[PDB]
Write a protein that binds this ligand. Structure first.
Ligand SMILES: *[B@@](*)([O])C1=[C]C(O[C])=[C]C(O[C])=[C]1
Ligand SMILES: *[B@](*)([O])C1=[C]C(O[C])=[C]C(O[C])=[C]1
Lengths: 277, 279
């Protein structure tokens, strides 16, 4: 039901209703044009109302991925790309400059449109802009946005793994190693994205996978289970126990913890050479 | 990676370390997802195995060449573990005509279980180091409920309280706060509302509110610019932003019914204002 304007790296989807001069609404944190539709039906007799889903939201869809660096606080890409999106939208719909209204961060997009592509702006309206760069109290509001984001992303995650570990009864040796941050601010944020991906896309899907004891017994001569000598009492040690109890597959003990192949690689290797040839 | 190999498979580019001579031994990483963690171990076995340590396709130096399917966020989707499992089977066949040695740790051992289930033709021997799979356990319900709970807790607890105090800092208006306190009417909407909000916090608010705009950039085009303040969002931080602009540039402010979300809270008074501005 939506219109489409295929751009570089995205199909931009937008509503279009009414008739008369083009007026483009840019959404804020909502990111989608549907929020403007009850306003649009009130305006359609006077303007060709265009309410855009910005490329990263809603019915829009990127066709190549975001640069990994878009994750970075002072990244430039998304906001310039969104502004250029609006410029191409206007140009595609109207030979003449159009009206534009942006709300909240969407009016920041509107500021970049009027900066980079003034030729498509006939009038522009900034509904309650939250930008702080030119404020005289700019560092205050920058630091605060920076701090609330750090707090929301990390603080919830750090407490959760801490209690999760004791629900699993994780050996101190692993828990020591697992929490030590990286030695690089880049190593630490790939480390956050890592654990965050793991929580959402791996642990539930993998630990409730369709594997039965039956499809272990088929190949019992090939399998060894392997328990850490530093991680006894932990949840994965019980899974191995249960498997061996019901199938007979043997449990070879091996130095280290859940991470023993990096904790005690030498002794880890010696056990593997023993079992295998 | 800086010394890594590549196997180009359906959907991704699989990067992996290779060291040593002899029988092929493939190591599958767990939660860290990358094979670099096996390298000191590999140095021990390099005289006896061709050690292959894998960056699984979503991690490290491997790269997807297709989008992850939408349904991979479902907690019951088979997709990722099957794809990893077959990523391994093709890696074996690409490296050896013989069946190979395989070791997986933690959720990497689960991947190895799916290699054995679906492609035992490639497994000479296999080892499961500390598997956390619960499906076949008689207390499987306990452990699956623990996983589902902790994950849902981590993904939401920080967000619920952080946005409450953030709005106190912004002095967000009641009409806006009552609205953004509302949950969507289905789980798919609540989840949608949640992904949107996490994306905005990570990829939008810091970038956009500190992007390169000076008041000079307004001065050129004062004739075109109108600024809009909700009559219902008084003393919220954006109004003070518009108050500063008007103070320093002379560009005027038009009051408009509703608050931060006024165009949908009061779309008839919003519309009426706009028609008098520009019609
Ligand atoms: B291995 O990364 C692992 C250990 C564990 O208990 C200590 C649980 C896991 O999944 C829930 C994974
Ligand atoms: B608008 O969506 C918006 C309002 C606000 O103060 C109430 C701050 C914002 O970002 C910092 C955005």
């Amino acid at each position: 039901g939506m219109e489409t304007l295929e751009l570089q790296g995205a199909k931009l989807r937008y509503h279009q209703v009414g008739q008369g001069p083009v007026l483009i609404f840019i959404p804020g944190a909502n990111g989608t044009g549907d929020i403007f539709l009850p306003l649009a039906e009130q305006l359609k007799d006077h303007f060709t109302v265009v309410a855009v889903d910005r490329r990263d939201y809603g019915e829009s869809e990127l066709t190549e991925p975001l640069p990994d660096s878009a994750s970075n606080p002072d990244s430039d890409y998304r906001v310039k790309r969104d502004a250029q999106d609006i410029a191409e939208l206007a140009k595609s719909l109207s030979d003449e400059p159009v009206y534009i209204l942006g709300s909240s961060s969407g009016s920041i997009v509107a500021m970049h449109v009027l900066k980079d592509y003034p030729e498509v702006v006939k009038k522009i309206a900034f509904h309650e802009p939250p930008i702080n760069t030119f404020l005289p109290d700019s560092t205050y509001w920058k630091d605060k946005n920076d701090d609330i984001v750090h707090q929301i992303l990390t603080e919830g995650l750090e407490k959760g793994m801490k209690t999760f570990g004791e629900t699993l009864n994780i050996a101190p040796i692993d828990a020591k190693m697992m929490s030590q941050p990286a030695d690089t601010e880049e190593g630490r944020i790939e480390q956050y994205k890592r654990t965050m991906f793991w929580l959402e896309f791996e642990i539930r899907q993998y630990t409730h996978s369709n594997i039965t004891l039956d499809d272990f017994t088929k190949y019992s001569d090939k399998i060894t289970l392997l328990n850490g000598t530093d991680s006894r009492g932990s949840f994965p040690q019980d899974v191995n126990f249960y498997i061996n109890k019901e199938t007979g597959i043997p449990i070879v003990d091996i130095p280290g913890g859940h991470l023993g192949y990096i904790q005690k690689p030498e002794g880890f290797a010696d056990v593997l050479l023993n079992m295998w040839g």
